[PDB]
Paper text:
β-d-Glucosidases (EC 3.2.1.21) are classical glycoside hydrolases that catalyse the hydrolysis of the nonreducing terminal glucose from β-linked d-gluco-oligosaccharides and aryl-β-d-glucosides. Here, the three-dimensional structures of two industrially important family [name] β-d-glucosidases from [name] and A. oryzae, solved by molecular replacement and refined at 1.95 Å resolution, are reported.
AfβG has two molecules of ethylene glycol in the substrate-binding site, occupying subsites +1 and −1, in molecules A and B; the former is hydrogen-bonded to Arg99 NH1 and NH2 and the latter to Asp93 OD1 and OD2 and to Lys190 NZ, as well as to the first ethylene glycol molecule. In molecule A, several molecules of ethylene glycol occupy the substrate-binding cleft, one of which overlays on the MPD molecule at the +4 subsite when superposed on the AaβG structure. Within the protomer, AfβG has two extra ion pairs, Lys151–Glu629 and Lys523–Asp516 (in addition, the former is relatively short at 2.6–2.9 Å), and the distance between residues 536 and 559 is shorter than that in AoβG (2.9 Å compared with 3.0–3.7 Å). AfβG is able to form two extra intermolecular salt bridges between Lys418 and Asp102 in both subunits of the dimer.
Author numbering:
A (entry chain A), B (entry chain B): 21 to 670, 674 to 863
Write the structure that this text describes.
């Protein structure tokens, strides 16, 4: 009955090909010098809260790796630190539709992480992709569209890695919701389950939707990939040989390392052989002093179960990432502590051991990164509706600012751990995807400053119970700006019954009544929404007193200043929604899985919609959104003309051949080489690589130690002989003939209005055939045009852009169905269209 | 037995002498043309909420007074309006010790009032003077010191009147507290009394303390005086022949008009003959449709009781004020409504009658008045303590801003009627002494802006219950700034049991615990107090972690900007405390009278301390204040040297002679002249001058109509013959030989530190003799000095400055006790001293 994940073995070994040759060579050179305990140190974290960073490996001080590799959250700024910046969330980056802004944000973040002593940034994210509009972590990623996500994910990775820090593509893969993601956490919420949720997805959907942005990340040169907490067809993400060995390593050709999510590692031998490379934070569960790896990995290799080539490959993949971004020349010891903001603390925080020492140096790493934050906030402010309220001119006599979302968090910008509250303006959602603010500029502050400077009077009512006081201010104002929000986050935090995932898609903090009060008293009401994702606005959006509506996402520390830049027209808004605004929750497709449906076994989440999420689903059901994917307004207008299409073919080459045999590097030795050194003071619960004695069974102490391999290990898992190459593989990101250009497309874009600004033209294709979506996004850019100016936008469609995943062939194939190309300003406003020429 | 107020009659008639000659002449010219109903219209308001302004008289359209004279609150900005400024409170002005700033604030206010169409500003105030540190309205005035108060009151009056608006010196006199000020209000608070509080004071104390600033106001040319709600020796303020006829009109030579406080008028004939000139808002009680004057005043003159010379004198005094400031050329109709902010409303708001019409024209009158407000706020920020925390340099790495008093009122700046709350930053206290803000710059906003511009990180915790959150921010900060407050107001509003008057002298909104939390976690804590008056700080002020303490008063709309100007040293603080900071409540003298002590008659408030209030009391009891009257710190130091004293080459001439007989102007006519015009639609409850019929008794309808004069009118009250001149009278402000200069005094002031700034030198005298305070303030200035610079400060002491009120002689006499002069930086730091030469 249950979804099954078939075996793919062995775990592919790194090949040092292409742009990875130099870093792999330097990795082989150092790993060839390492003993087994040194290798194991790289693969295994030293335990929860045992060092400075949220994750930290063992060290190799004999060879100059003098402190462990340090991994730190988050995808929008350094977590658990100080004197750092708080960037706009991923969903805002997607709303900019701007490759360059995604790159620069990545670079700015990389600089901060580097300057704090961090080796590995735990991000950015393209999983969750965005199947569920109420999924708790959708905002951390980019968009439910895989092409928008993959492009901006890849640019963000390149910025981070150009700054000298290893990026970690996460969460791989199908962790679309928070409910049932972890057994202990589910049990704490009162649910009786004994395994995590299983995401069950067909092979075509996997390739065409969820995997696609990870292909982009690999091709962009991402150093690490983080495996997820959920299962995929009932095999855990950190030991799923299909996703890790076959799709990521054999097909996408990934040459870096796979790192577990925190306590997502569920077996020693099983995970190592199924493609895991690094166990974080290193213990079985936080501070239990046990490890699936560490000592157990040393023993698994000494007893012959995990071949030497596999542990050698782990250490090579890790060191390859290290050398690829230059950690050997850039790394400095972490100069802050995740676990306290005090100057002094215990060296090993979890157990109060080691030296009482200076754990925070107070190093300011902000530089002028406030400028890119302000910029991105303004370029991610989506103007959804504008019947002439905007821009503001500075001649407004009285301005009202209404709603708690305009005001300060009265507990301070950092006053709730992991931002686990919805107090004041919503500039950052909750969980591990967070950073501490250096400050937070509110809409109230920025609007008040600006109104005053223009001679206006201005009043801010920020108590969402004070409805009569709001009504009076609204009645007296020339324009009323009303602020509302909706929040969500990671599932280890629940705010008002939202257990990560949101329990509805409507407004928080009495926002529905706030809107009603203001709109019924002011015929020039502008609604500004800060939110993690879509909100159901059908009830009020079309009221004629609502003269403009803005979605500004989660803008980070410069929130108010970004917003006023757009309100007053210093920046002409250009952002487009990176998701659909539907009429009802049901319009989006299936609800979250929030009740166990497989007894007390793993809840089963069948991805029955296949590729049809967000706009694809609305298009297939012929549903009319309130605001479609790709919609946003400008203070000017843009016209589209002169579509031209030209074939370039001049062929796909399915990859054929064999790998090398699995190499080994560095002598393994025997148990007598790997005892705990005499005179080493063992730190309580710290995870080490060493053995209590030369008796391997006693040093491991596994209760099932020593079975025949075939009782618990799949066939081929230990086979280091040459393996066949997969047809759809061949280079990082897949077969390189996928990236050959087949068609060139041009369209002329004209600023047909009176104000300079950026437009986001979009190019969609129809691949044809029964059950293909009517249109799917393939190209976009953000282009600046003065009034009356024209530019010719030219792009190319490659083989992969026009292909479908053919499950019978196990390859990408351009089908025989007739295709079309469409260019315009959104997924529904597509005035240019033409047939594509036949290419294969 | 009970305090008694002896008769002084007749009510002195205006004489047109000196600077008043031109305006009195025009008043006579116009009043000589008026009929009796026209005269009565000037004297009598038209009823509560019957027109645009808080008070409005009848009109005289036949002679070009085409709408009634408009009186509007408040002493710190226009009340019940829009598009106006909100100025620092009177207590802030006193803290500046700066004559020019006081003048400029009055001028800025006058400009706003004039441009809204208002004739008469209901302010400024010198009553309450400040006998009670917990008195509810002490912040509206200046200082408990009569000289600091009189000088700044006079400069405020001059500014207002130089802008073309009549100033109203209030409240005259001895309304030192709010408890029992009004019968109906006291009964609403559960007290059983049938008359208002009687303030009972000896003659010398009256002259040397409470009356002294009113002398200053009269000499400065104030057009109106407002009489008080309380009794003086058991005769109501608005019919007290001693205070109105004798002290104000006969002795101080006042040539303007006396106006009642609102519903403070308590009889027709009695009050007219005792010296009242204008009844506001014109009804007996609000909207009862009855008047002690109006119809009743017409009848009182027609029946022979109130002589024609008295009603003629009322009209002449009112018109003298109107001409003195130029209302004939400057007046425009009021262009706002006090009773609604909507554009449209009923012409007569109280009864919804007259036309439905445009009552608000939305005229902006702010100009650049924000500049003088910011300036006065900075110049009123008293630096009480500084052990090196200030000024801030911009190098602070992390800045904490703690306390609700830093943050916004979440109901909006104008979210509580008459500011009757203590939400967010305290920039204005409550009651009639208020204005609506155009905006309000909080300390949070301004500090955050400034820190961010310097590269600091900044966090604001504004929930006074969030103590652990404040502790964590305080622990992490380089400097913590903690904001606390204490509020009070007029007695028609009670907040948390403070029935106008404050129920204690300690902090509001959990401030004592906020200070404890911050100071116990940060060794560089700056405390900023916003308050109506003194707060008891003995418990925490001397904690060595409190590195500075500021009292910033009630700074109006620019609060946060005024403050950051001083914090960062753009302004070098120069303010001095205008009251004493004592150790205990008892240190100040007698408690408020808060329980009835005379059965259910008038509570009796005996002013037994005489001239010994505030610093005079501390000095007489040899108590050590925490911070003495006149204390404030600078970022530099000032030295005092080279005292020189010289008797002037240059006697007092007691006034002797007689007045003119009382004049009459305009023919009175008879009852048939003063019927309601045929076809005039009478507005419900509006107050008119006219008679229902020629039967005077029926038109009046007084239940005790028609007694013989001697049964209810004191002897002399109807005597229009020539009267003796009082010895201590002779010109506005009293005998002009009081103001002859007798001694010149010089002292050299040096800036002995390294920062430019203003110093406030102070000159005190000891008048000598057993009954006399050790020192009393006589002269002060604010003088700017560059580092190392010296200036010679020269001033003159006049006859009044060295005199005592001699009760036997009923005159000012320089006594034969030896006197001394003292110069220095506070009432206690007086390094220069010398005997004064004998002068008389
Ligand atoms: C014209 O026309 C006109 C118009 O119309 C008119 O007029 C009118 O007139 C009438 C008569 O006729 C009147 O009436 C009256 O009045 C009175 C007054 O009153 C007021 O005042 C008071 C006070 O007084 C005082 O002061 C003043 C000033 O300020 C003066 O003026 C006076 O004279 C006096 O003097 C005194 O003192 C002083 C000090 O203080 C000094 O300085 C001097 O020298 C002297 O000594 C007051 O009190 C009052 O008050 C009240 O009222 C009010 C209002 O409402 C209120 O608010 C308050 O609070 C109060 O109240 C209370 O009281 C009340 C009753 O009265 C009740 O109801 C309540 O509840 C409460 O409790 C006023 O302000 C009067 O007095 C009178 O009466 C009387 O009598 C009756 C009857 O019998 C009674 O009932 C009452 O009670 C009273 O009694 C008293 O007196 C008597 C005698 O006279 C006696 O016997 C008794 O015992 C008693 O005694 C006591 O007290 C007193 C005081 O009061 C004292 O002095 C003693 O010693 C004791 O202790 C009557 O009412 C009217 O007003 C008029 N009106 C108008 C509109 O103006 C005419 O008439 C015509 N003519 C022809 C020819 O036709
Ligand atoms: C989707 O998911 C969302 C996220 O999980 C979820 O969000 C939640 O939404 C609900 C609403 O749907 C929110 O709850 C509402 O919050 C309102 C605002 O609460 C705050 O303000 C209150 C009012 O304060 C005024 O009144 C006080 C009492 O007089 C004064 O003390 C105040 O000074 C203030 O004054 C103003 O009003 C005075 C007149 O009352 C006036 O004189 C004065 O001048 C001035 O104008 C506070 O009381 C409240 O604080 C109390 O309650 C909270 C908990 O709710 C405590 O933490 C506090 O300690 C304190 O006890 C807040 O500060 C509420 O007004 C609203 O109440 C109404 O509904 C509740 C039950 O639902 C009733 O008990 C109550 O009587 C109210 O009924 C009225 O309205 C309802 C419509 O809602 C109507 O049916 C009814 O007939 C009646 O008219 C309610 O609690 C909640 O905060 C959101 N949570 C989060 C985390 O965001 C959302 O629900 C989900 N969507 C759906 C559809 O499921
Ligand atoms: C002189 O004249 C002055 C002017 O009139 C006069 O002023 C008044 O002073 C008093 C005393 O200082 C003031 O009243 C105090 O106000 C404090 C703050 O109130 C606000 O915050 C409260 C706490 O909020 C936190 O806790 C809540 C409950 O857990 C949470 O829901 C919140 O989210 C918040 O969280 C923080 O703390 C949590 C731990 O608790 C923590 O988990 C979290 O992370 C975070 O850190 C709120 O409860 C309160 O709101 C409630 O109550 C008010 C009424 O007070 C209602 O209007 C609200 O609707 C709501 O129901 C406010 O928002 C209070 O902490 C303090 O409480 C203490 O005293 C009362 C009795 O007086 C006890 O019932 C209470 O248990 C507390 O006891 C503790 O402290 C006292 C010390 O006072 C101690 O003796 C005792 O042993 C114990 O330790 C108190 O109410 C008042 O506001 C002032 N009024 C004005 C107008 O300014 C002054 O008193 C006069 N002077 C004298 C000496 O007479
Ligand atoms: C709003 O209403 C007013 C009066 O009802 C009208 O004059 C104005 O044109 C309206 N403005 C908008 C935004 O339509
Ligand atoms: C406060 O404490 C710090 C401890 O780091 C100390 O270095 C500093 O000199 C102290 N400053 C004051 C204001 O005394």
């Amino acid at each position: 009955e249950l979804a099954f994940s078939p075996p793919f073995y062995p775990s592919p070994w790194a090949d040092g090909q292409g742009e990875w040759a130099d870093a792999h060579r330097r990795a082989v050179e150092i790993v060839s010098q390492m003993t087994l305990a040194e290798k194991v140190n790289l693969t295994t974290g030293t335990g929860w809260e045992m060092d400075r960073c949220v994750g930290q490996t063992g060290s190799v001080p004999r060879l100059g790796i003098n402190w462990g590799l340090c991994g730190q959250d988050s995808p929008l700024g350094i977590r658990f630190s100080d004197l750092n910046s708080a960037f706009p969330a991923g969903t805002n980056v997607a709303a900019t539709w701007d490759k360059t802004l995604a790159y620069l944000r990545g670079k700015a973040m990389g600089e901060e992480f580097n300057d704090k002593g961090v080796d590995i940034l735990l991000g950015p994210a393209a999983g969750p992709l965005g199947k569920y509009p109420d999924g708790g972590r959708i905002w951390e990623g980019f968009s439910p569209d895989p092409v928008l996500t993959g492009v901006l994910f890849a640019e963000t990775i390149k910025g981070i890695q150009d700054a000298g820090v290893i990026a970690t593509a996460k969460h791989y893969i199908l962790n679309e919701q928070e409910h049932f993601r972890q057994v202990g956490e589910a049990q704490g919420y009162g649910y009786n389950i004994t395994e995590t949720i299983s995401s069950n997805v067909d092979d075509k959907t996997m390739h065409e939707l969820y995997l696609w942005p990870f292909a982009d990340a690999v091709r962009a040169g991402v150093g690490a990939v983080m495996c997820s907490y959920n299962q995929i067809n009932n095999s855990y993400g950190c030991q799923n040989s299909q996703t890790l060995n076959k799709l990521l390593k054999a097909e996408l050709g990934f040459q870096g390392f796979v790192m577990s999510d925190w306590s997502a590692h569920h077996s020693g031998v099983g995970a190592a052989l199924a493609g895991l490379d690094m166990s974080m934070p290193g213990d079985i569960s936080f501070d239990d002093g046990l490890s699936f790896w560490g000592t157990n990995l040393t023993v698994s290799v000494l007893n012959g179960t995990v071949p030497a080539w596999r542990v050698d490959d782990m250490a090579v993949r890790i060191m390859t990432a290290y050398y690829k971004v230059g950690r050997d020349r850039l790394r400095i010891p972490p100069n802050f502590s995740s676990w306290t903001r005090d100057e002094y603390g215990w060296e090993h925080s979890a157990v109060s051991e080691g030296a009482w020492t200076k754990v925070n140096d107070f190093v300011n790493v902000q530089r002028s990164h406030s400028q890119i934050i302000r910029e991105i906030g303004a370029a991610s402010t989506v103007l959804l509706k504008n019947t002439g309220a905007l821009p503001l001119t500075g001649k407004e006599v009285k301005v009202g600012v209404l709603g708690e979302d305009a005001g300060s968090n009265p507990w301070g910008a950092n006053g709730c751990p992991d931002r686990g509250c919805d107090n004041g303006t919503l500039a950052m959602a909750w969980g591990s995807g967070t950073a501490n603010f250096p400050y937070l500029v509110t809409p109230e502050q920025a609007i008040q400053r600006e109104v005053i400077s223009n001679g206006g009077n201005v009043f801010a009512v920020t108590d969402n119970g004070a409805l009569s006081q709001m009504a009076d201010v609204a009645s007296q104002s020339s324009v009323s700006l009303v602020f509302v929000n909706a929040d969500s986050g990671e599932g280890f935090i629940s705010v008002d019954g939202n257990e990560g995932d949101r329990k509805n898609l409507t407004l928080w903090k009495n926002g529905e009544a706030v809107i009603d009060t203001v709109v019924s008293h002011c015929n020039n009401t502008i609604v500004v929404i800060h939110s993690v994702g879509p909100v159901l606005i059908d009830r009020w959006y079309d009221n004629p007193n609502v003269t403009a509506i803005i979605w500004a996402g989660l803008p980070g520390q410069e929130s108010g200043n970004s917003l006023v830049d757009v309100l007053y027209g210093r920046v002409n808004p250009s952002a487009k929604t990176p998701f659909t605004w539907g009429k009802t929750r049901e319009s989006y497709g299936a609800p979250l899985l929030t009740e166990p449906n497989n007894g007390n076994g793993a809840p089963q989440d069948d991805f029955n919609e296949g590729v049809f999420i967000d706009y694809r689903h609305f298009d297939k059901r012929n549903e009319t959104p309130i605001y479609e994917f790709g919609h946003g307004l400008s203070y000017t207008t843009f016209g589209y003309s002169h579509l031209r299409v030209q074939a370039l073919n001049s062929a796909y080459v399915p990859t054929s051949g064999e790998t090398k045999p699995a190499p080994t590097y560095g002598e393994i030795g025997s148990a007598a080489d790997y005892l705990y050194p005499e005179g080493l003071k063992r730190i309580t619960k710290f995870i080490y690589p060493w053995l209590n004695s030369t008796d391997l069974e006693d040093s491991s102490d596994d209760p099932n130690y020593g079975w025949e391999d075939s009782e618990y290990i799949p066939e081929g898992a230990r086979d280091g002989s040459p393996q066949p190459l997969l047809k759809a593989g061949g280079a990082p990101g897949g077969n390189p003939t996928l990236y050959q250009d087949l068609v060139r497309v041009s369209a002329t874009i004209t600023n047909t209005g009176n104000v300079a600004g950026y437009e986001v033209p979009q190019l969609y294709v129809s691949l044809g055939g029964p059950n293909e979506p009517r249109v799917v996004l393939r190209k976009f850019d953000r282009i600046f045009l003065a009034p009356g100016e024209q530019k010719v936008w030219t792009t190319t469609l490659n083989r992969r852009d026009l292909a479908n995943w053919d499950v019978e062939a196990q390859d990408w194939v351009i089908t025989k169905y007739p295709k079309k190309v469409h260019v315009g300003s959104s997924s529904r406003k597509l005035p240019l269209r033409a047939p594509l020429p036949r290419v294969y």
